[PDB]
Amino acid sequence: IPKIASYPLPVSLPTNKVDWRIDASRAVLLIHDMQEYFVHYFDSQAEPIPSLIKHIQQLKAHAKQAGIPVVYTAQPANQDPAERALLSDFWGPGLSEETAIIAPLAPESGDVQLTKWRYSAFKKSPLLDWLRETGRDQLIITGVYAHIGILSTALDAFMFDIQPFVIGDGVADFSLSDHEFSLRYISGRTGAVKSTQQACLEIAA
Amino acid sequence: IPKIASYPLPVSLPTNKVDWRIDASRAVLLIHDMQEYFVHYFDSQAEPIPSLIKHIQQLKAHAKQAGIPVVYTAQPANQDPAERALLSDFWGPGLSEETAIIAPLAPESGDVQLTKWRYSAFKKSPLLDWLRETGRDQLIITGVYAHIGILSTALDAFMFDIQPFVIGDGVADFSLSDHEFSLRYISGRTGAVKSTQQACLEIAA
Ligand SMILES: CCCCCCCCO[C@@H]1O[C@H](CO)[C@@H](O)[C@H](O)[C@H]1O
Ligand SMILES: CCCCCCCCO[C@@H]1O[C@H](CO)[C@@H](O)[C@H](O)[C@H]1O
Ligand SMILES: [Ca+2]
Ligand SMILES: [Ca+2]
């Protein structure tokens, strides 16, 4: 029995307050924590996982063709307890294995791989400095889990003057309810939610 | 007609995953954005505002007696558009008046007053450096609005290895639903929720 019961990826997405559009010259695609460890909490042969993976694959292929850099985040194995700090009080010691990015989303030679220390991909990482150095100010966000690391990364991005585009059918979560609440929060407060379809159209311009 | 309809402060609070207790030697009391501007979205003579203010007053008095520093945050008037950046796309130009901390919570001579630039009190502020310099690693959080700046500040604190204690009947929000969801999120993911009553007991030790 999977820890996360099967559910269908949302097709209907919340409306955005902002009119932002992805621009290939401005954007970076983040594939957030798509590690074996996190995916194994689902039955990966059941919804939402096959469609999630297909969508991220599509976004990655379009991003590549459009010249959008791709960045992965991954939590490290055997995170030092002192360094992991308060996370352990919420989740225990963390992963010891299954750290690899899932094979269908294998990073390629030019894709950046960041170590993920906290909910937000920005924390204790070079992400902000790299975005600022390169002048990239849009962050397209995919992966798991919507209400935790996806939301926290979007919040940091937005506060750092980086437009977050969270892909509504390009993330998954502990439940459909958590997933949909995450998208509502994002559209209402801290970014733009886009479908995979719409993001690909904006990317390809 | 107030923009935020009257609602009763929650008495029942979510359970915590963590066993943390406020320690007067470790803690700082944050009074977050209790400015005239934000309070005026409510009828201040109607619930939850009279009890909110009473609770924050009580916490402040207990904090003072226990030697816990008190820090206020306040959004500045006429925030420069370039600096305000993406916030304007969600909220418009920001406040031009009503910037004062509400009189019943008047800062005293030794209370720190930080300028609030983003949802999180940490962003573009000396808050983290001050906490680290002083060795204070617990942040008691009160004020408005629960699901936005309170939640975002708690997230940053937690990720910066600072234990957040969000006071469930010491914050308010756009609605009871937003308020209660905020507390559930915090208890589940990024801090401890405490009642004013329980926090005062832990403070007074
Ligand atoms: C409903 C059941 C799903 C539970 C998934 C548990 C995942 C455990 O993993 C934890 O996830 C956290 C949140 O991203 C990370 O911050 C931690 O580092 C990680 O240890
Ligand atoms: C439901 C109606 C309540 C609306 C309250 C609107 C408050 C407008 O104010 C905005 O609040 C934001 C969130 O804290 C801040 O980040 C902005 O700086 C501020 O301009
Ligand atoms: Ca996560
Ligand atoms: Ca707020």
Side-chain angles (χ1 to χ4, degrees), chain B residues 7-10 13-14 48 52 143 146-147 166-186:
Chain B
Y7 74 86
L9 280 174
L13 306 176
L52 172 69
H147 81 285
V166 175
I167 306 307
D169 60 357
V171 300
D173 212 341
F174 288 11
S175 67
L176 180 59
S177 181
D178 286 356
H179 187 148
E180 296 198 300
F181 277 115
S182 299
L183 301 183
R184 286 193 281 270
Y185 185 99
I186 292 157

mmCIF file of all heavy atoms in Angstrom, chain B residues 7-10 13-14 48 52 143 146-147 166-186:
data_model
loop_
_atom_site.group_PDB
_atom_site.id
_atom_site.type_symbol
_atom_site.label_atom_id
_atom_site.label_comp_id
_atom_site.label_asym_id
_atom_site.label_seq_id
_atom_site.Cartn_x
_atom_site.Cartn_y
_atom_site.Cartn_z
ATOM 1 N N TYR B 7 -14.954 37.505 12.938
ATOM 2 C CA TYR B 7 -14.942 36.104 13.268
ATOM 3 C C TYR B 7 -14.262 35.921 14.615
ATOM 4 O O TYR B 7 -13.470 36.766 15.038
ATOM 5 C CB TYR B 7 -14.239 35.294 12.173
ATOM 6 C CG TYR B 7 -12.729 35.415 12.114
ATOM 7 C CD1 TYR B 7 -11.922 34.609 12.903
ATOM 8 C CD2 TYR B 7 -12.117 36.335 11.273
ATOM 9 C CE1 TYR B 7 -10.526 34.694 12.847
ATOM 10 C CE2 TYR B 7 -10.726 36.434 11.205
ATOM 11 C CZ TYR B 7 -9.938 35.611 12.000
ATOM 12 O OH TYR B 7 -8.556 35.671 11.940
ATOM 13 N N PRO B 8 -14.584 34.820 15.307
ATOM 14 C CA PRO B 8 -14.016 34.590 16.641
ATOM 15 C C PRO B 8 -12.618 33.964 16.568
ATOM 16 O O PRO B 8 -12.385 33.057 15.768
ATOM 17 C CB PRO B 8 -15.009 33.609 17.277
ATOM 18 C CG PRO B 8 -15.602 32.868 16.107
ATOM 19 C CD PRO B 8 -15.629 33.832 14.961
ATOM 20 N N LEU B 9 -11.694 34.444 17.390
ATOM 21 C CA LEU B 9 -10.374 33.835 17.452
ATOM 22 C C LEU B 9 -10.525 32.385 17.827
ATOM 23 O O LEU B 9 -11.299 32.053 18.733
ATOM 24 C CB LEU B 9 -9.478 34.475 18.521
ATOM 25 C CG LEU B 9 -8.751 35.771 18.273
ATOM 26 C CD1 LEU B 9 -8.094 36.177 19.587
ATOM 27 C CD2 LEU B 9 -7.784 35.653 17.140
ATOM 28 N N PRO B 10 -9.755 31.512 17.164
ATOM 29 C CA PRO B 10 -9.825 30.096 17.519
ATOM 30 C C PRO B 10 -9.380 29.867 18.958
ATOM 31 O O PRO B 10 -8.400 30.462 19.428
ATOM 32 C CB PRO B 10 -8.827 29.434 16.561
ATOM 33 C CG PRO B 10 -8.397 30.458 15.609
ATOM 34 C CD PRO B 10 -8.801 31.789 16.082
ATOM 35 N N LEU B 13 -6.729 24.625 19.077
ATOM 36 C CA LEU B 13 -5.591 24.765 18.200
ATOM 37 C C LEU B 13 -5.095 23.375 17.755
ATOM 38 O O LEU B 13 -5.348 22.349 18.390
ATOM 39 C CB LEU B 13 -4.517 25.611 18.894
ATOM 40 C CG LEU B 13 -4.971 26.998 19.417
ATOM 41 C CD1 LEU B 13 -3.807 27.674 20.160
ATOM 42 C CD2 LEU B 13 -5.511 27.960 18.332
ATOM 43 N N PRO B 14 -4.414 23.325 16.627
ATOM 44 C CA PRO B 14 -3.929 22.029 16.163
ATOM 45 C C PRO B 14 -2.852 21.496 17.084
ATOM 46 O O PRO B 14 -2.195 22.248 17.801
ATOM 47 C CB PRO B 14 -3.351 22.340 14.781
ATOM 48 C CG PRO B 14 -3.141 23.753 14.750
ATOM 49 C CD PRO B 14 -4.040 24.423 15.729
ATOM 50 N N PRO B 48 -12.108 39.332 15.521
ATOM 51 C CA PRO B 48 -11.200 38.861 16.582
ATOM 52 C C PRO B 48 -10.305 39.937 17.203
ATOM 53 O O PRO B 48 -9.385 39.605 17.965
ATOM 54 C CB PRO B 48 -10.305 37.872 15.825
ATOM 55 C CG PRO B 48 -10.146 38.545 14.475
ATOM 56 C CD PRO B 48 -11.524 39.135 14.180
ATOM 57 N N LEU B 52 -7.491 39.722 20.168
ATOM 58 C CA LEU B 52 -6.155 39.668 19.598
ATOM 59 C C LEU B 52 -5.235 40.652 20.317
ATOM 60 O O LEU B 52 -4.123 40.315 20.740
ATOM 61 C CB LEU B 52 -6.183 39.980 18.099
ATOM 62 C CG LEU B 52 -4.805 40.136 17.447
ATOM 63 C CD1 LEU B 52 -4.081 38.802 17.404
ATOM 64 C CD2 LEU B 52 -4.978 40.707 16.048
ATOM 65 N N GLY B 143 0.602 38.694 15.377
ATOM 66 C CA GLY B 143 0.227 39.754 14.442
ATOM 67 C C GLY B 143 -0.626 39.314 13.278
ATOM 68 O O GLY B 143 -1.329 38.305 13.371
ATOM 69 N N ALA B 146 -2.069 35.847 9.254
ATOM 70 C CA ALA B 146 -1.558 34.501 9.509
ATOM 71 C C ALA B 146 -1.039 33.800 8.259
ATOM 72 O O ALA B 146 0.087 33.288 8.279
ATOM 73 C CB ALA B 146 -2.625 33.653 10.223
ATOM 74 N N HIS B 147 -1.817 33.797 7.177
ATOM 75 C CA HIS B 147 -1.452 32.957 6.036
ATOM 76 C C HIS B 147 -0.402 33.581 5.132
ATOM 77 O O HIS B 147 0.075 32.907 4.223
ATOM 78 C CB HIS B 147 -2.684 32.525 5.211
ATOM 79 C CG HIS B 147 -3.209 33.543 4.230
ATOM 80 N ND1 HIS B 147 -3.937 34.653 4.613
ATOM 81 C CD2 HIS B 147 -3.148 33.590 2.873
ATOM 82 C CE1 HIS B 147 -4.305 35.330 3.534
ATOM 83 N NE2 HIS B 147 -3.827 34.716 2.464
ATOM 84 N N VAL B 166 4.176 30.105 16.823
ATOM 85 C CA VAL B 166 3.132 30.975 16.349
ATOM 86 C C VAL B 166 1.983 30.899 17.330
ATOM 87 O O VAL B 166 1.523 29.816 17.678
ATOM 88 C CB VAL B 166 2.693 30.600 14.934
ATOM 89 C CG1 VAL B 166 1.506 31.434 14.494
ATOM 90 C CG2 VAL B 166 3.859 30.770 13.951
ATOM 91 N N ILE B 167 1.526 32.061 17.790
ATOM 92 C CA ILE B 167 0.505 32.091 18.824
ATOM 93 C C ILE B 167 -0.880 32.056 18.152
ATOM 94 O O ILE B 167 -1.285 32.995 17.464
ATOM 95 C CB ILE B 167 0.662 33.341 19.711
ATOM 96 C CG1 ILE B 167 2.090 33.440 20.279
ATOM 97 C CG2 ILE B 167 -0.348 33.315 20.849
ATOM 98 C CD1 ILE B 167 2.556 32.160 20.995
ATOM 99 N N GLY B 168 -1.586 30.950 18.348
ATOM 100 C CA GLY B 168 -2.796 30.693 17.600
ATOM 101 C C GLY B 168 -3.896 31.716 17.814
ATOM 102 O O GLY B 168 -4.630 32.068 16.861
ATOM 103 N N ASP B 169 -4.029 32.201 19.051
ATOM 104 C CA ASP B 169 -4.977 33.259 19.357
ATOM 105 C C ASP B 169 -4.252 34.598 19.554
ATOM 106 O O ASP B 169 -4.772 35.532 20.192
ATOM 107 C CB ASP B 169 -5.832 32.882 20.573
ATOM 108 C CG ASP B 169 -5.019 32.634 21.829
ATOM 109 O OD1 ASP B 169 -3.776 32.685 21.779
ATOM 110 O OD2 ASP B 169 -5.650 32.379 22.880
ATOM 111 N N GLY B 170 -3.065 34.700 18.948
ATOM 112 C CA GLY B 170 -2.270 35.918 18.944
ATOM 113 C C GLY B 170 -1.939 36.361 17.527
ATOM 114 O O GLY B 170 -1.046 37.158 17.319
ATOM 115 N N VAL B 171 -2.686 35.836 16.563
ATOM 116 C CA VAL B 171 -2.603 36.269 15.174
ATOM 117 C C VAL B 171 -4.052 36.437 14.704
ATOM 118 O O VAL B 171 -4.977 35.965 15.360
ATOM 119 C CB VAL B 171 -1.842 35.254 14.268
ATOM 120 C CG1 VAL B 171 -0.418 35.076 14.764
ATOM 121 C CG2 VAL B 171 -2.582 33.902 14.181
ATOM 122 N N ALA B 172 -4.231 37.067 13.552
ATOM 123 C CA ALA B 172 -5.527 37.088 12.868
ATOM 124 C C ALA B 172 -5.269 37.082 11.366
ATOM 125 O O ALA B 172 -4.113 37.161 10.909
ATOM 126 C CB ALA B 172 -6.414 38.276 13.302
ATOM 127 N N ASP B 173 -6.336 36.998 10.584
ATOM 128 C CA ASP B 173 -6.199 36.709 9.167
ATOM 129 C C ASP B 173 -7.424 37.219 8.407
ATOM 130 O O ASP B 173 -8.325 37.826 8.999
ATOM 131 C CB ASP B 173 -6.034 35.187 8.958
ATOM 132 C CG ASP B 173 -5.162 34.839 7.762
ATOM 133 O OD1 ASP B 173 -4.978 35.724 6.886
ATOM 134 O OD2 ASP B 173 -4.656 33.684 7.714
ATOM 135 N N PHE B 174 -7.456 36.949 7.097
ATOM 136 C CA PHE B 174 -8.527 37.414 6.217
ATOM 137 C C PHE B 174 -9.860 36.742 6.535
ATOM 138 O O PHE B 174 -10.918 37.251 6.142
ATOM 139 C CB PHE B 174 -8.217 37.081 4.746
ATOM 140 C CG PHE B 174 -7.118 37.907 4.119
ATOM 141 C CD1 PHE B 174 -6.291 38.734 4.866
ATOM 142 C CD2 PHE B 174 -6.908 37.829 2.732
ATOM 143 C CE1 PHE B 174 -5.307 39.485 4.235
ATOM 144 C CE2 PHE B 174 -5.918 38.553 2.127
ATOM 145 C CZ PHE B 174 -5.126 39.394 2.871
ATOM 146 N N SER B 175 -9.800 35.578 7.170
ATOM 147 C CA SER B 175 -10.983 34.800 7.522
ATOM 148 C C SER B 175 -10.589 33.740 8.547
ATOM 149 O O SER B 175 -9.414 33.405 8.698
ATOM 150 C CB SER B 175 -11.559 34.110 6.283
ATOM 151 O OG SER B 175 -10.647 33.119 5.811
ATOM 152 N N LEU B 176 -11.574 33.197 9.251
ATOM 153 C CA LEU B 176 -11.332 32.080 10.148
ATOM 154 C C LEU B 176 -10.738 30.906 9.394
ATOM 155 O O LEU B 176 -9.822 30.260 9.891
ATOM 156 C CB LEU B 176 -12.622 31.661 10.862
ATOM 157 C CG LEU B 176 -12.500 30.492 11.842
ATOM 158 C CD1 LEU B 176 -11.492 30.779 12.957
ATOM 159 C CD2 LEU B 176 -13.865 30.190 12.440
ATOM 160 N N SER B 177 -11.216 30.635 8.178
ATOM 161 C CA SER B 177 -10.699 29.517 7.397
ATOM 162 C C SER B 177 -9.208 29.702 7.099
ATOM 163 O O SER B 177 -8.403 28.780 7.292
ATOM 164 C CB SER B 177 -11.487 29.362 6.093
ATOM 165 O OG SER B 177 -10.996 28.270 5.346
ATOM 166 N N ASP B 178 -8.828 30.897 6.646
ATOM 167 C CA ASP B 178 -7.419 31.149 6.343
ATOM 168 C C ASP B 178 -6.582 31.014 7.632
ATOM 169 O O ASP B 178 -5.481 30.451 7.630
ATOM 170 C CB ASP B 178 -7.178 32.548 5.773
ATOM 171 C CG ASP B 178 -7.640 32.716 4.331
ATOM 172 O OD1 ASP B 178 -8.091 31.730 3.703
ATOM 173 O OD2 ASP B 178 -7.496 33.856 3.820
ATOM 174 N N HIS B 179 -7.116 31.549 8.723
ATOM 175 C CA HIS B 179 -6.449 31.522 10.027
ATOM 176 C C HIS B 179 -6.194 30.066 10.456
ATOM 177 O O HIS B 179 -5.080 29.686 10.827
ATOM 178 C CB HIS B 179 -7.348 32.263 11.025
ATOM 179 C CG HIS B 179 -6.753 32.488 12.387
ATOM 180 N ND1 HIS B 179 -7.079 33.599 13.136
ATOM 181 C CD2 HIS B 179 -5.922 31.748 13.163
ATOM 182 C CE1 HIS B 179 -6.460 33.543 14.302
ATOM 183 N NE2 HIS B 179 -5.752 32.429 14.349
ATOM 184 N N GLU B 180 -7.236 29.248 10.449
ATOM 185 C CA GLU B 180 -7.101 27.871 10.914
ATOM 186 C C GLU B 180 -6.219 27.027 9.993
ATOM 187 O O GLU B 180 -5.433 26.206 10.462
ATOM 188 C CB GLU B 180 -8.474 27.243 11.137
ATOM 189 C CG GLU B 180 -9.224 27.991 12.258
ATOM 190 C CD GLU B 180 -10.376 27.229 12.855
ATOM 191 O OE1 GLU B 180 -11.310 26.897 12.102
ATOM 192 O OE2 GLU B 180 -10.351 26.963 14.080
ATOM 193 N N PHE B 181 -6.311 27.231 8.687
ATOM 194 C CA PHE B 181 -5.423 26.524 7.776
ATOM 195 C C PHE B 181 -3.967 26.903 8.041
ATOM 196 O O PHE B 181 -3.072 26.051 8.008
ATOM 197 C CB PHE B 181 -5.821 26.768 6.329
ATOM 198 C CG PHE B 181 -6.937 25.863 5.852
ATOM 199 C CD1 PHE B 181 -8.172 26.385 5.502
ATOM 200 C CD2 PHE B 181 -6.754 24.489 5.780
ATOM 201 C CE1 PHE B 181 -9.198 25.564 5.073
ATOM 202 C CE2 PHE B 181 -7.778 23.660 5.355
ATOM 203 C CZ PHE B 181 -9.002 24.202 5.003
ATOM 204 N N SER B 182 -3.728 28.179 8.330
ATOM 205 C CA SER B 182 -2.374 28.628 8.621
ATOM 206 C C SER B 182 -1.805 27.868 9.821
ATOM 207 O O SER B 182 -0.660 27.405 9.797
ATOM 208 C CB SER B 182 -2.323 30.139 8.907
ATOM 209 O OG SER B 182 -2.772 30.902 7.805
ATOM 210 N N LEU B 183 -2.602 27.756 10.880
ATOM 211 C CA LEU B 183 -2.127 27.089 12.091
ATOM 212 C C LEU B 183 -1.892 25.604 11.830
ATOM 213 O O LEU B 183 -0.927 25.030 12.319
ATOM 214 C CB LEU B 183 -3.111 27.270 13.236
ATOM 215 C CG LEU B 183 -3.396 28.710 13.639
ATOM 216 C CD1 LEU B 183 -4.333 28.711 14.828
ATOM 217 C CD2 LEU B 183 -2.093 29.479 13.925
ATOM 218 N N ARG B 184 -2.768 24.980 11.055
ATOM 219 C CA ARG B 184 -2.575 23.574 10.705
ATOM 220 C C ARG B 184 -1.268 23.380 9.914
ATOM 221 O O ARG B 184 -0.501 22.443 10.144
ATOM 222 C CB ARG B 184 -3.791 23.065 9.919
ATOM 223 C CG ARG B 184 -5.018 22.843 10.772
ATOM 224 C CD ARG B 184 -6.088 22.036 10.015
ATOM 225 N NE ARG B 184 -6.828 22.882 9.080
ATOM 226 C CZ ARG B 184 -7.938 23.555 9.389
ATOM 227 N NH1 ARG B 184 -8.461 23.479 10.609
ATOM 228 N NH2 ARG B 184 -8.533 24.304 8.474
ATOM 229 N N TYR B 185 -1.015 24.284 8.975
ATOM 230 C CA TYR B 185 0.194 24.189 8.165
ATOM 231 C C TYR B 185 1.427 24.323 9.080
ATOM 232 O O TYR B 185 2.388 23.553 9.002
ATOM 233 C CB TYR B 185 0.213 25.275 7.074
ATOM 234 C CG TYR B 185 1.377 25.127 6.154
ATOM 235 C CD1 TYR B 185 1.231 24.507 4.919
ATOM 236 C CD2 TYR B 185 2.636 25.535 6.540
ATOM 237 C CE1 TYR B 185 2.308 24.316 4.079
ATOM 238 C CE2 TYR B 185 3.737 25.357 5.702
ATOM 239 C CZ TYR B 185 3.576 24.731 4.481
ATOM 240 O OH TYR B 185 4.669 24.551 3.660
ATOM 241 N N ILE B 186 1.404 25.316 9.952
ATOM 242 C CA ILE B 186 2.536 25.577 10.818
ATOM 243 C C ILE B 186 2.829 24.383 11.730
ATOM 244 O O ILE B 186 3.935 23.860 11.717
ATOM 245 C CB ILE B 186 2.349 26.908 11.579
ATOM 246 C CG1 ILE B 186 2.417 28.082 10.586
ATOM 247 C CG2 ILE B 186 3.413 27.047 12.660
ATOM 248 C CD1 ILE B 186 1.740 29.368 11.029
#
